[PDB]
Amino acid sequence: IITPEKKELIRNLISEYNITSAKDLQEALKDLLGDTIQNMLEAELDEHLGYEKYESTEEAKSNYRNGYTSKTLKSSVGQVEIDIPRDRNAEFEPKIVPRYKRDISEIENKIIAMYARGMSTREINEQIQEIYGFEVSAEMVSKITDKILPEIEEWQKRPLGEVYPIVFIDAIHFSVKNDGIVGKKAVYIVLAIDIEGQKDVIGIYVGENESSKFWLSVLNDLKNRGVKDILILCADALSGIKDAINAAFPNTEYQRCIVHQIRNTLKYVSDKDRKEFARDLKRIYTAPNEKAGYDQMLEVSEKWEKKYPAAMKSWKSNWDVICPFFKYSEELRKIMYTTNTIESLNSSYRRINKSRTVFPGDQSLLKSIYLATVKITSKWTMRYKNWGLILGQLQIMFEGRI
Amino acid sequence: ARKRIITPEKKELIRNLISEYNITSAKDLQEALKDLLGDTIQNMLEAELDEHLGRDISEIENKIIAMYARGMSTREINEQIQEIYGFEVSAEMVSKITDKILPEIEEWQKRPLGEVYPIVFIDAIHFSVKNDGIVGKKAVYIVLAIDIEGQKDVIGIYVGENESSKFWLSVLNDLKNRGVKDILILCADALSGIKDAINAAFPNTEYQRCIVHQIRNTLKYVSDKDRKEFARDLKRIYTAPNEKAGYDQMLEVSEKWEKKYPAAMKSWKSNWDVICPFFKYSEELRKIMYTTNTIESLNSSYRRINKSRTVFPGDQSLLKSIYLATVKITSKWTMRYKNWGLILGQLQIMFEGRI
DNA sequence: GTTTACACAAAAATATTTACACTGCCGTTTTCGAGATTGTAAAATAT
DNA sequence: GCAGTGTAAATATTTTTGTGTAAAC
DNA sequence: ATATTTTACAATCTCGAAAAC
């Protein structure tokens, strides 16, 4: 309190609105808000209709002002009862409060943020009832979160770059209702690295289970958003990726995603033999050449086949596709296989969808994944390290490309 | 007060502020009220802790308690309260607001209990807290029983720093002082002095090792890929019709899984003789026994309330937090069980005079 | 007279239930990425 | 088995609107 | 001439989540 005018106003308020004790101050703030809204509405009515309170009109008019209504509003202070009459001919639109609005839009964004951070619709209802006094149903949360569908439709069709050096495709499965039955559907997330060294999600796609055409529709969409050339594409073995990648971007060299390979093989090992097993596995892909990597593969397979025999079978079966990973440099392959690039997104999505399991509709799952995606990408404004050297090696490998 | 007609001398106080703050929308007035009243509310609340020598309370303090109930840190509560009022929340402030509910928790921990409870579970969770300026590890034990009416109200909470038989006996005697005479079933993980105090207080009470902790502690050793089959085998372990068939299924799964996880089934084979056999009760009770997701729900909530990495010093703050977290849920899962009549009939047939 | 104020049906526009068609077997410590507060001296300011 | 879920459809709950008359001027 | 503030300058400390025991 440094303003003398506002301090005199505060004194007039405390001596005028009968401030008594702690139980009375909240009711006094509520009635203060109500009376301020009443004064503003009376001013707006006298300015719009023009006729003052019992003022001798100069001309003979046929219109009048009469009515009685009670609008039980609610705001940040809590539910507030108020009442302001209307005009006779039912022609008066209050601008401070709309003709049917009863809430405060300053908290709608916070409701959206609460839904995005992981809280459920009923949990948001409980919290709002606890801290804000008034009740907001779960269907109100659903309407609030539906009110941002055009924002998602606009986000998924934004202008992209020209050439992306590395782009990963990651599949994550969830439970959704379709055609009246709950099933397990996979939503795919495309995460690319920009030539500036930045990292950001390109797009999200749900449905059209394991179709070669669907992948092309994704790739063509990438083209329609303005993509011309992809150098590296890391993706787990799926139905129509490898087929469609040659149909859309034949110059794109394709490699099987290594971040899923290292994670999927540790599913067979125990919770205690994970530090050592990873260490040896780390030497499998940090080998200088492909023959050294194959030899380390044989060594670790023979070492851990006694306890976990089915762990290295996937490596031995797919090593032919794992081969094109030893072409890239160490500083670039490290960026390729690092856990924070892909596993962080999956862990965050699982951490936000731990409560929500059975999404009623693909729209709800898309909305949830989009909100989680924005909440994570809001923190990826950092550049990569040693990006100049990586870009030099990339231009050396792919001449005339970047 | 049939109408909202007030003294018309407030129009000056309304108009001066509405013309100074340039209030063209409700947002302007809403952001102005907090700026004008935050310091006032802060300077008024800083005197409530001094008004006492050191009956509900104000609504703002109830809101702060509700915020502290969800498991929010002081910074989260500070942001949440600046979004409305605009002032900051200190450690002494939240400490006083939590201390103001000391009579309620002290009367709840001294609340008169029932007489005979058919089934009682006890779950222990350990945390690290600062006390008297030293960091230590204290264990809080929660006793949750189901009454003969079929309800599942929480019985009590007790914190200590010792797995000693003396403390356990003192807890049981405290429960006796609360007016309990007979407990029929006691579900508890293997601890140091459990069986000693159980035989000292209720020797006729049949005591069995809690199976929900056994399946959780045994599945911790298996891998993330060989967990579905291992779970299926354990399901065949505890869904067996008789106790000997269950013993045979346990031997089978042990001999099958000793090649990959030798130390996983060792606890089962080691403790099957002394506490494992729960197979006297019927399946209508055995299902509720091995599916009691309420204990794990409470434990998961307690883990979710651990946003404060180390709890605020002194045992009183952790006790307050655990009490409010337990009450906020138990006030809404006080509903009846299903097919409880059959279980009660089986219990009265098994325990004729209710021992 | 002039103008408002007000109880009541009737209509319009939201907020809350209801139903649904299913899902769900989980730690402790280390490290990390920032955020907040302030150490710390010293550079500018002044009682 | 008990506890959750996000939203389509369906109620339930206000607000607001037609007044025909009583009050404030 | 010294005492006071605030301010660069980070510097340290602290603190809320993913990662790894």
Automatic annotation (TrEMBL), chain B:
A GO biological process held by the record: DNA transposition
The entry's keywords: DNA recombination, DNA-binding, Transposable element, Transposition
GO molecular function: DNA binding; transposase activity
Domain of life of the native organism: Bacteria
InterPro entries, sorted: Transposase_mutator (IPR001207)
Pfam families (alphabetical): Transposase_mut (PF00872)
Family: Belongs to the transposase mutator family.
Biological role: Required for the transposition of the insertion element.
Name assigned to this protein: Mutator family transposase
